[PDB]
Amino acid sequence: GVDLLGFLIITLNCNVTMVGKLWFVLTMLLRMLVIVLAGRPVYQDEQERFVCNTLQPGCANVCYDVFSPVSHLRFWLIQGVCVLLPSAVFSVYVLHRGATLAALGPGLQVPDFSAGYIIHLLLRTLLEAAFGALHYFLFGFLAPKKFPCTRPPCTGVVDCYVSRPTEKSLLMLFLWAVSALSFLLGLADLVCSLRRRMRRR
């Protein structure tokens, strides 16, 4: 005998473990917040000071074009949105299937949404290692300090200087560390959740 703003969140909380909520909090507070708030200003001047010894117009632009095909800030943001998408689609799924059964009607009668959470965590584990592999094969571990440029709309080889490398290396090391921690915690979620459901058998 509860209102449906009542038996609508227990059907949400009971199907998710506290480790999952902790994962959500860590990946929204230290992962979704640092990138927009600190990564946005640092990478604005990646264009302004790609300064290096040439004089004919149009060498520096092609030098940076061959230098940075894809900035890793966009990589981080797309990785973040894809690693947050399934938690939203599952949220919509569970709210949709919880708000519908109460309309028909009949010490609670909480439904058991266990089949989708394990496949959810499987998709989580699969969607992190691959993007980590792409990060490792594309951007490495530490950013270069200088770059030789040879594709000529300009005469000769131009030795061209990046702007502010140490900040970038430290910040991306921090992102690597937090991503590694999240990966292990996510692996812990599934391996604990599967055991805590066959124990009833």
Task: Kindly identify the residues of this chain, within the stretch 54-73, that bind its own copies according to CB under 8 A.
Answer: 57-58, 61-62, 64-65, 69-71, 73
Q: Which of 89, 133, 134, 173 binds its own copies (CB under 8 A)?
A: 89
Contact 60, 52 (CB under 8 A): yes
Strand extents, DSSP E, 108-163: 146-149, 158-161
Footprint on residues 4-63 left by its own copies (CB under 8 A) = 4-6, 9-10, 13-14, 18, 21-22, 25-26, 29-30, 33-34, 36-38, 40-45, 47-49, 51-53, 57-58, 61-62
Footprint on residues 128-157 left by its own copies (CB under 8 A) = none
Q: Using the rule CB under 8 A, is 180 a contact of its own copies? A: no
Q: Which of 132, 163, 176, 181 binds its own copies (CB under 8 A)?
A: 163
Q: Which is nearer to its own copies, 112 or 137 (CB)?
A: 112
Tell me, letter by letter, the H, E, C secondary structure of 8-72.
Answer: CCHHHHCCCCHHHHHHHHHHHHCCHHHHHHHHHHHCHHHCCCCCECCCCCCHHHHHHHHHCCCCH
Q: Which is nearer to its own copies, 85 or 150 (CB)?
A: 85
CA distance 186 to 123: 11
Q: Which is nearer to its own copies, 82 or 150 (CB)?
A: 82
Residue 182 Cβ, how far from its own copies at the closest point, in Å?
A: 14
CA distance 2 to 5: 8
| Contact mark string toward its own copies, 92..121, x via CB under 8 A | xx-xx--xx-xxxx-xx-x-x-xx--xx--
CA distance 194 to 189: 9
Give which of 82, 81, 114 is closest to 97, Cα–Cα.
Answer: 114
